[PDB]
């Protein structure tokens, strides 16, 4: 159901069909799975263990991991706890975060390698998306990112309840690695108006388009609404890399995306201001973009 | 609380402590985890998918996989189905089994590589167990083996029910790869008097000592009673390699394990005959070994 895109295949000629499949998934659904991503299974297995080690830390160690670099670190709960790292595209922030974690050295080094590999992956995905719209020369390498590790502490009581309410991601694109054993990711299919489970598929990643994706693409890429249902009584652990917006914080569709049959949809805006707008309105499912129409 | 043994570490000098931990786990519990086993993570990931692909085959493809070599192939169900391969230590049998599976070539190749790698593992484990009892020169390379791929088709109605009843393995040693998501394996811990779960730990294997282990070791290695509770409403998939008995089928303890304080416990017997005896008495938890006292 959710399209699977092989990233090694996507490209030209023989890759042309897979690139068109990529664009179609971004346009119709805003969500797809990625294979061919090049992240080694050994590193994935080390990261799974390391993230569980981190969340299995005594509460007091977890709390020494709060605010270890400005704005980032451990975030306590309501069944939710997380480690967040901004700016995950900045090598000096990634280095200091991992050096500052109260954790065993082998854990800190695995997190560092994985955040670095996820950054390269989301930049590679963003580039292939941009090329499916005919855009070359775009570099996403220095766009700020937010790396997050989360755990949802499900119990028997929370089974059946949406373990995360419906929202869009504010930013451009998101790459997610879901718990293999507990999948709850559901995305609203904009063509039927129905939630579609994104069942876990080991060793692959999920990609979601966010609000900045919709705006930068001049409406061509769908900012996907999604939620997480609690589907078992077991803690769910997941990892996400959020590609946010350009380094200069300005969101503006590129020239070549304004047609004549698809006129320019949104005024130029600053990502940080948009984030404030979601905050003050409570509109966290893309509604606030309507207030930014051109 | 199941001891974990690092196989690269175990051996001499610097591994003398680990070897003694190995023997102690075998003698007191009959069960231990192995790390450092050298099965690469990529192969483990490919096998998890291949085994799930095999069990997801249509019913007609599964029936075409019954009896593909004499005595081996698919076995249908109540909630249990499986693919078994004897003799998994015999290259000719492994080759013909995988050549004859009705499945895509990449599945056949993955199963072949896995069966072969699991064979090398269980031989290496057997050798280290033998060395922990001061035994060298022993070669297990040609002992018959059974390779099994299992699926227990749990549902909401299965939860809280035994998945497999309490028994011992008849053979020497068993190496298991349990479903990372669905546990359920429990062993009767001698020190405790109650069954204790062997919760899955990704990328690690569980080793269990069987009845032939107890007899060959002259009583020094415990043949562990185990079962599997249904702990979740999703299918549980597992892989096991059973090291059975010597090629000449005779079970007889080596001289150096019978001393003034531990005299010879069991008469020599043919493994085949011992299997018959379990089948005809219904004694599947090691009770039938008492009929073989010296
Ligand atoms: O996009 C973000 O994660 C930051 C943010 C700012 N105001 C918000 C409202 C709802 C959801 C997220 C945000
Ligand atoms: O494992 C098998 O398929 C054969 C077997 C060996 N010992 C057994 C005890 C009870 C039932 C079957 C067996
Ligand atoms: O799906 C998850 O568990 C975390 C990522 C998420 O839900 C989000 O995009 O904010
Ligand atoms: O299929 C399994 O998970 C193992 C069942 C069992 O009791 C065994 O290993 O003999």
Numbering used by the authors:
A (entry chain A), B (entry chain B): 3 to 79, 84 to 300
Original authors' sentences:
Here, we determined an X-ray crystal structure and performed functional analyses of two rice 2ODD family enzymes, OsGA2ox3 and OsDAO, which catabolize plant growth hormones GA4 and IAA, respectively. Both enzymes formed tetramers for OsGA2ox3, and dimers for OsDAO with the aid of their substrates, thereby enhancing their activity, as schematically summarized in Fig. 5c. With increasing substrate concentration, the enzyme gradually forms a multimer with the aid of the substrate itself (effecter), thereby resulting in an increase in enzymatic activity and in the active catabolism of GA or IAA to maintain hormonal homeostasis. The results revealed that a monomer–multimer switching occurs based on a substrate level, and that the resulting conformational change enhances the activities of these enzymes to maintain phytohormone homeostasis, in full agreement with the allosteric theory by Monod and co-workers.
We elucidated the crystal structure of OsDAO complexed with its substrate, IAA, at a 2.0-Å resolution. As expected, OsDAO had a stereotype structure of 2ODD, and formed a dimer containing two IAA molecules at the interface region. An IAA contacting subunit A (green stick) interacted with R154 and S176 of subunit A and R282 of subunit B via a water molecule, while the other IAA on subunit B (cyan stick) interacted with R281, R290, and S176 of subunit B and R282 of subunit A. These subunits directly interacted with each other through hydrogen bonds at residues D278, D279, R281, and R282. The elution profile of gel filtration showed that dimer formation of OsDAO occurred in the presence of IAA but not in its absence. Km for IAA of the dimer was nearly fivefold lower than that of the monomer, while consistently, Vmax of the dimer was 22-fold higher than that of the monomer. These observations demonstrated that the activity of an auxin-catabolizing enzyme, DAO, is regulated by the same mechanism that regulates GA2ox; namely, through substrate-mediated multimerization. Recent studies have revealed that DAO controls IAA concentration, which is important for modulating auxin homeostasis, since it is dependent on catabolizing IAA. Interestingly, all DAOs listed in Supplementary Fig. 10 share Arg or Lys at residue 308 in OsGA2ox3, which is essential for GA4-dependent oligomerization and hyperactivation, as previously mentioned.
